[PDB]
Design a protein around this ligand. Sequence first.
Ligand code: ZN
Ligand code: ZN
Lengths: 12, 205
Amino acid sequence: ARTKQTARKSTG
Amino acid sequence: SMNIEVARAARLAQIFKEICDGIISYRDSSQQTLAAPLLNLPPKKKNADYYEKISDPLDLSTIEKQILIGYYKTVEAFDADMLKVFRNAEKYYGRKSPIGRDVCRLRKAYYSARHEASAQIDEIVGETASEADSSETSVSEKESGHEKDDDVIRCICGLYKDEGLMIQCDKCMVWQHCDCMGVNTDVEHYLCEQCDPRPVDREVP
Ligand SMILES: [Zn+2]
Ligand SMILES: [Zn+2]
């Protein structure tokens, strides 16, 4: 099951 | 005492027998039983991992015997068992279609016979069991509503916003926050408080 961790996940 | 319920149960039972018979011993021209990987549970000893995630792999030859004992009674549970063995087959055997084309062929002949046996079901059960001829392998109604995307939020919060940590209903493919539902973001096959509400009996007096 997919897990979101805050809608934005900008790494760089 | 007379009961229509027991008449219906036994009616469909011998009739499911017809259909499941065609699937269990479904053979291609080279006389191969395609449902072989599904009709027999595998050696338990060398499959702890397999049965860990798939704690309900199921067995068609056993489902067969459970049909005659009238355990399923109606098609509801019957159709469930069939679609179950096919789906877990496609799941862990490979990427998504391992034996897929083989067991999906069975599944096609399954829905064909399903469609066939719908005749008697109509005379016995009626329309309370509906037609169940909406194709697919996952859900039957599929939509059963208005909207149900992959990106859709559905938590008891009511925010409808993708905040914090959240997991995905295997059936709704909807997003539910982990802290709210009491999850550990470890679920591989989480289901929502609708499809299949999981009861957690945490020391309740
Ligand atoms: Zn929430
Ligand atoms: Zn759901």
